[PDB]
Amino acid sequence: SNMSLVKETVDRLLKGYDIRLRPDFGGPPVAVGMNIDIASIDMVSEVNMDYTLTMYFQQAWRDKRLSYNVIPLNLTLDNRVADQLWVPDTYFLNDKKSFVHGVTVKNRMIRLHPDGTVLYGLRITTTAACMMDLRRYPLDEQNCTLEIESYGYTTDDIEFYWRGDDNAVTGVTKIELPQFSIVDYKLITKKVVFSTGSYPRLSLSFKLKRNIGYFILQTYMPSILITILSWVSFWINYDASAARVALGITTVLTMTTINTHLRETLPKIPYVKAIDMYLMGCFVFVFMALLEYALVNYIFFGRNAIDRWSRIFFPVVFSFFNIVYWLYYV
Amino acid sequence: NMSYVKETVDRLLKGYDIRLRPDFGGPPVDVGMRIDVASIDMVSEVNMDYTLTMYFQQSWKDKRLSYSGIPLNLTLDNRVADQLWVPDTYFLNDKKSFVHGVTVKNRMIRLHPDGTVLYGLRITTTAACMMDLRRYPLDEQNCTLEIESYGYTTDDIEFYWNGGEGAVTGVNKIELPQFSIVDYKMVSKKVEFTTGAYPRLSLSFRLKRNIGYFILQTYMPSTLITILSWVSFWINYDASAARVALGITTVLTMTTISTHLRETLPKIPYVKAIDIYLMGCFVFVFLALLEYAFVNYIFNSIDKWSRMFFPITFSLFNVVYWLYY
Amino acid sequence: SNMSYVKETVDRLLKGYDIRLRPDFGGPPVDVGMRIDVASIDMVSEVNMDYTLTMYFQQSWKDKRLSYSGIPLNLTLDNRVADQLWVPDTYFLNDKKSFVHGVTVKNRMIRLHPDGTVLYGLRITTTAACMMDLRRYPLDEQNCTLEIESYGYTTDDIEFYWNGGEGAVTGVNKIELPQFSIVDYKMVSKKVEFTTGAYPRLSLSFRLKRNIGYFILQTYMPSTLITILSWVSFWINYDASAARVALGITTVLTMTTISTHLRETLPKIPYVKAIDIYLMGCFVFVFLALLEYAFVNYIFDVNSIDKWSRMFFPITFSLFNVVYWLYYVH
Amino acid sequence: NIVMTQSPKSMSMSVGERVTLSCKASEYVGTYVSWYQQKPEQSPKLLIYGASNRYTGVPDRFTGSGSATDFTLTIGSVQAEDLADYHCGQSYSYPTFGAGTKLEL
Amino acid sequence: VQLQQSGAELVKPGASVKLSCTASGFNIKDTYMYWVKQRPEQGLEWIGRIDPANGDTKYDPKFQGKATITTDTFSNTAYLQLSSLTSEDTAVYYCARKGLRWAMDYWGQGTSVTVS
Amino acid sequence: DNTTVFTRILDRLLDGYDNRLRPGLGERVTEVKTDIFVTSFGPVSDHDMEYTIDVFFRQSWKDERLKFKGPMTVLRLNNLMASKIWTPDTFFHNGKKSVAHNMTMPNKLLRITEDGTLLYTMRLTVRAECPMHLEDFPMDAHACPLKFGSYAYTRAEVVYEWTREPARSVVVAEDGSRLNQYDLLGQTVDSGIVQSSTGEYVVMTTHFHLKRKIGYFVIQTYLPCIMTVILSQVSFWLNRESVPARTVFGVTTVLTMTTLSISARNSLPKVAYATAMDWFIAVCYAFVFSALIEFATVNYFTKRGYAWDTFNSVSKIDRLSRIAFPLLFGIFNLVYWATYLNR
Amino acid sequence: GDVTVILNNLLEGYDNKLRPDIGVKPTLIHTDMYVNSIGPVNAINMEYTIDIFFAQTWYDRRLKFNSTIKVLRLNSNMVGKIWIPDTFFRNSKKADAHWITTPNRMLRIWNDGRVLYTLRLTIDAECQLQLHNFPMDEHSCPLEFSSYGYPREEIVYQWKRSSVEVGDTRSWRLYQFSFVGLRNTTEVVKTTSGDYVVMSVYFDLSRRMGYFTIQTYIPCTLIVVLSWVSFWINKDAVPARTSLGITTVLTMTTLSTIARKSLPKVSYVTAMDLFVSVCFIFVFSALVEYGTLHYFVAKMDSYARIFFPTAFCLFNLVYWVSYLY
Ligand SMILES: CCCCCCCC(=O)OC[C@H](COP(=O)(O)O[C@@H]1[C@H](O)[C@H](O)[C@@H](OP(=O)(O)O)[C@H](OP(=O)(O)O)[C@H]1O)OC(=O)CCCCCCC
Ligand SMILES: *[C@@H]1O[C@H](CO)[C@@H](O[C@@H]2O[C@H](CO)[C@@H](O[C@@H]3O[C@H](CO)[C@@H](O)[C@H](O)[C@@H]3O)[C@H](O)[C@H]2NC(C)=O)[C@H](O)[C@H]1NC(C)=O
Ligand SMILES: *[C@@H]1O[C@H](CO)[C@@H](O[C@@H]2O[C@H](CO)[C@@H](O)[C@H](O)[C@H]2NC(C)=O)[C@H](O)[C@H]1NC(C)=O
Ligand SMILES: *[C@@H]1O[C@H](CO)[C@@H](O)[C@H](O)[C@H]1NC(C)=O
Ligand SMILES: *[C@@H]1O[C@H](CO)[C@@H](O)[C@H](O)[C@H]1NC(C)=O
Ligand SMILES: *[C@@H]1O[C@H](CO)[C@@H](O)[C@H](O)[C@H]1NC(C)=O
Ligand SMILES: *[C@@H]1O[C@H](CO)[C@@H](O)[C@H](O)[C@H]1NC(C)=O
Q: Which of B209, B230, B245 is the last residue of a domain?
A: B209
Q: Are G43 and G147 in the same domain?
A: yes
List of domains in chain D? 4-103 (2.60.40.10)
Q: Is residue A306 part of a domain?
A: yes
Does the beta carbon of G162 sit less than 6 angstroms from any atom of ligand 7? yes
Is residue A119 within 8 Å of residue A113, measured between CB atoms?
yes
Q: Are B50 and B91 in the same domain?
A: yes
Instruction: Quickly list DSSP for B284-313.
Output: HHHHHHHHHHHHHHH---HHHHTTTTHHHH
Sort out which chain B residues have CB atoms less than 8 A from C6's CB and list them.
17, 20, 24-25
**Optimal mutation site among F160, F162, F191, interface D, most CBs of chain D within 10 A:** F191
Q: Which residues line ligand 5 (CB under 6 A)?
A: C 143, 145, 184, 186, 188, 203, 205, 207
d(CA B61, CA B116): 5
| Strand-pair category, C158-162 with C30-45 | parallel
> Which positions in chain E have a beta carbon within 8 angstroms of at least one beta carbon in chain F?
27, 29-30, 53, 100-102
Domain count, chain B: 2
For C75, residues 6+ apart whose C-beta sits below 8 A from its C-beta are: C6, C9, C10, C68, C111, C112, C113, C114
| Strand-pair category, B29-44 with C95-100 | unpaired
Question: Touching A: which chains, 3+ CB pairs < 8 A?
Answer: F, G
Ligand 3 nearest atom to the CA of residue A73, by list position = 27
Q: Which of F181, F211, F241 is the last residue of a domain?
A: F211
Element (H, E) at F141: strand F141-150
Q: Are G29 and G167 in the same domain?
A: yes
Does the beta carbon of A70 sit less than 6 angstroms from any atom of ligand 3? no
Residue D58's Cβ-count burial label (10 Å; 0-12, 13-18, 19+) is middle
Residue G149's Cβ-count burial label (10 Å; 0-12, 13-18, 19+) is buried
- Helix, strand or coil, per DSSP, at residue F50: strand
User: What is the least distance, in Å, from the CA of F178 to any CA of chain B?
Assistant: 23
Q: Which of G170, G186, G207 is the last residue of a domain?
A: G207
d(CA F241, CA F309): 12
**Optimal mutation site among E2, E102, E109, E112, interface D, most CBs of chain D within 10 A:** E102
User: Is F61 known to sit in a ligand binding site?
Assistant: no
Q: Are F160 and F226 in the same domain?
A: no
- Helix, strand or coil, per DSSP, at residue F9: helix
Q: Are G160 and G246 in the same domain?
A: no
**Optimal mutation site among C196, C202, C247, interface G, most CBs of chain G within 10 A:** C196
CA dihedral defined by F2, F5, F10, F12, rounded to 10 degrees? 150
Resolution, rounded to a tenth of an Å?
Answer: 3.4
d(CA C70, CA C84): 21
Is residue B193 within 8 Å of residue B238, measured between CB atoms?
no
Q: Are F33 and F125 in the same domain?
A: yes
Using the Cβ of B150 and the Cβ atoms of chain F, whether some distance falls under 8 Å is answered with no
| HSE-CB of A32 using CA atoms within 13 angstroms | 29
Ligand 4 nearest atom to the CA of residue B205, by list position = 14
d(CA C163, CA B202): 31
Q: Are C191 and C265 in the same domain?
A: no
Closest-CA residue to D7 (of D73, D77, D62, D91): D73
Residues 201-240 of F with CB under 8 A from B: none
Q: At B40, which CATH number?
A: 2.70.170.10
Q: Are C39 and C182 in the same domain?
A: yes
Q: Are C138 and C272 in the same domain?
A: no
In A81-196, at which residue ranges do the beta strands (DSSP E only) sit? 91-92, 95-100, 108-112, 117-129, 141-149, 158-162, 169-170, 180-194
Does the beta carbon of G170 sit less than 6 angstroms from any atom of ligand 7? no
Q: Which of F179, F211, F243 is the last residue of a domain?
A: F211
Is residue G243 within 8 Å of residue G211, measured between CB atoms?
no
Using the Cβ of C81 and the Cβ atoms of chain B, whether some distance falls under 8 Å is answered with yes
d(CA C230, CA C226): 6
Query: What domain range is G176 assigned to?
Result: 2-207
Is residue C275 within 8 Å of residue C134, measured between CB atoms?
no
d(CA B163, CA B183): 18
Closest-CA residue to F287 (of F310, F245, F257): F257
Q: At G155, which CATH number?
A: 2.70.170.10
Q: Is residue A2 part of a domain?
A: no
Does the beta carbon of B200 sit less than 6 angstroms from any atom of ligand 4? no
Q: DSSP class of residue C164?
A: S
Ligand nearest to the CA of F241: 1
Question: Touching D: which chains, 3+ CB pairs < 8 A?
Answer: E, F
Mutate-to-test residue for ligand 3 from A74, A77, A120, highest number of ligand atoms within 8 A of CB? A74
Q: What is the C-alpha radius of gyration for chain D, rounded to an integer number of angstroms?
A: 13
Using the Cβ of C213 and the Cβ atoms of chain B, whether some distance falls under 8 Å is answered with yes
Q: Are B194 and B296 in the same domain?
A: no
Q: Is residue A1 part of a domain?
A: no
Cα four-point dihedral sign B172, B178, B182, B186: negative
Q: Are A125 and A90 in the same domain?
A: yes
CA–CA–CA angle G179, G180, G186 (5° rounding): 100
Which method, experimentally, gave rise to this model? cryo-EM
Q: Are A235 and A304 in the same domain?
A: yes
d(CA A323, CA B192): 80
Ligand 2 centroid, distance to A164 Cα (angstroms): 19
Mutate-to-test residue for ligand 2 from A188, A202, A206, highest number of ligand atoms within 8 A of CB? A188
Is residue C198 within 8 Å of residue C29, measured between CB atoms?
no
| HSE-CB of A299 using CA atoms within 13 angstroms | 10
Q: Are B102 and B198 in the same domain?
A: yes
Note whether E101 contacts F161, CB cutoff 8 Å: yes
| Strand-pair category, G34-38 with G50-52 | antiparallel
Q: Are G43 and G153 in the same domain?
A: yes
Instruction: Quickly list DSSP for chain E.
Output: -EEEE---EEE-TT--EEEEEEEESS-GGGS-EEEEEE-TTS-EEEEEEEETTTTEEEE-TTSSSSEEEEEETTTTEEEEEE-S--GGG-EEEEEEE--TTS----B---EEEEE-
Ligand 1 nearest atom to the CA of residue F314, by list position = 16
Q: What is the C-alpha radius of gyration for chain G, rounded to an integer number of angstroms?
A: 31
Q: Please enumerate, as own/partner, the contacts of B196-199 that have beta carbons within 8 Å and a separation of 24 or more.
A: B196/B153, B196/B154, B197/B153, B197/B154, B197/B155, B198/B148, B198/B149, B198/B150, B198/B152, B198/B153, B198/B154, B199/B148, B199/B149, B199/B154, B199/B157, B199/B158, B199/B159
- List binding-site positions of B for 4-aminobutanoate: 150, 195
Q: DSSP class of residue F65?
A: G
Q: Is residue A160 part of a domain?
A: yes
Cα four-point dihedral sign G261, G262, G265, G270: negative
Amino acid at C279: L
CB atoms within 10 A of CB G264: 14
For B149, residues 6+ apart whose C-beta sits below 8 A from its C-beta are: B87, B88, B89, B90, B156, B157, B159, B198, B199
Q: Which of F189, F211, F233 is the last residue of a domain?
A: F211
Q: What is the C-alpha radius of gyration for chain F, rounded to an integer number of angstroms?
A: 32
For G158, residues 6+ apart whose C-beta sits below 8 A from its C-beta are: G28, G29, G30, G31, G186
| Strand-pair category, F124-129 with F99-100 | antiparallel
d(CA B284, CA B310): 8
d(CA G14, CA F336): 81
From the list F167, F188, F192, which residue is nearest D93 (CB)?
F167
Element (H, E) at G228: helix G218-229
Is residue G84 within 8 Å of residue G118, measured between CB atoms?
no
Q: Are C78 and C17 in the same domain?
A: yes
d(CA B267, CA B61): 48
User: What is the least distance, in Å, from the CA of F2 to any CA of chain B?
Assistant: 35
From the list E58, E60, E104, which residue is nearest D46 (CB)?
E104
Is residue A293 within 8 Å of residue A233, measured between CB atoms?
yes
Using the Cβ of B171 and the Cβ atoms of chain F, whether some distance falls under 8 Å is answered with no
Q: Which of G192, G207, G222 is the last residue of a domain?
A: G207
d(CA D87, CA D46): 10
User: What is the least distance, in Å, from the CA of G232 to any CA of chain C?
Assistant: 6
Q: Are C58 and C116 in the same domain?
A: yes
Ligand nearest to the CA of F174: 2
Q: Which of C163, C182, C209 is the last residue of a domain?
A: C209
Q: Are C106 and C235 in the same domain?
A: no
Sort out which chain E residues have CB atoms less than 8 A from F191's CB and list them.
101
Q: Are F260 and F183 in the same domain?
A: no
d(CA B40, CA B32): 23
Q: Which of A210, A233, A268 is the last residue of a domain?
A: A210
Q: DSSP class of residue B213?
A: T
User: Is F237 known to sit in a ligand binding site?
Assistant: yes
Query: What domain range is F126 assigned to?
Result: 4-211
Cα four-point dihedral sign C304, C310, C314, C317: positive
Helix axes F223-232, A274-297, angle to 10 degrees: 10
Q: Say whether the peptide bond before residue A222 is cis (omega within 30 degrees of 0).
A: no
Q: At B235, which CATH number?
A: 1.20.58.390
Give the Å distances, CA to CA, from G181 to G92, G112, G166, G324: 21, 36, 10, 20
Q: Does domain E2-115 have CATH number 2.60.40.10?
A: yes
Q: Which residue of F has its CA nearest to D68?
A: F190
CB atoms within 10 A of CB B3: 9
CB atoms within 10 A of CB C284: 12
Question: Touching F: which chains, 3+ CB pairs < 8 A?
Answer: A, B, D, E
Sort out which chain B residues have CB atoms less than 8 A from F271's CB and list them.
177, 212-213
Residues 300-319 of F with CB under 8 A from B: 300, 302, 305
Domain count, chain F: 2
Q: Which residue of F has its CA nearest to A156?
A: F76
d(CA G178, CA G201): 17
Q: Are C10 and C142 in the same domain?
A: yes
Q: Are F182 and F243 in the same domain?
A: no
Q: Are G15 and G120 in the same domain?
A: yes
Closest-CA residue to B44 (of B147, B146, B179): B179
Q: How would you classify residue B15: left for phi > 0, otherwise alpha for psi between -120 and 50, otherwise beta?
A: left
Q: Which residue of E has its CA nearest to F204?
A: E101
Query: What domain range is C287 assigned to?
Result: 213-328
Dihedrals phi, psi of A319, to nearest 5 degrees: -65, -35
User: Is C151 known to sit in a ligand binding site?
Assistant: yes
Q: Which residue of E has its CA nearest to D31?
A: E101
Mutate-to-test residue for ligand 5 from C133, C145, C192, highest number of ligand atoms within 8 A of CB? C145
Element (H, E) at C280: helix C274-299
Q: Say whether the peptide bond before residue D8 is cis (omega within 30 degrees of 0).
A: yes
Domain count, chain G: 2
Dihedrals phi, psi of A29, to nearest 5 degrees: -70, 150
- List binding-site positions of B: 90, 149-150, 195
From the list B24, B97, B255, which residue is nearest C2 (CB)?
B24
- Helix, strand or coil, per DSSP, at residue A262: helix
Is residue G157 within 8 Å of residue G199, measured between CB atoms?
yes
Does the beta carbon of G319 sit less than 6 angstroms from any atom of ligand 7? no
Instruction: Quickly list DSSP for F229-296.
Output: HHHHTTGGGS-SS-HHHHHHHHHHHHHHHHHHHHHHHTTS---SS--HHHHHHHHHHHHHHHHHHHHH
CA dihedral defined by B130, B135, B140, B143, rounded to 10 degrees? 10
Q: At F283, which CATH number?
A: 1.20.58.390
Sort out which chain F residues have CB atoms less than 8 A from E29's CB and list them.
115
Q: Please enumerate, as own/partner, the contacts of B69-72 that have beta carbons within 8 Å and a separation of 24 or more.
A: B69/B4, B69/B7, B69/B8, B70/B4, B70/B5, B70/B8, B70/B113, B70/F26, B71/B113, B72/B113, B72/F26
Closest-CA residue to G46 (of G160, G109, G139, G179): G139
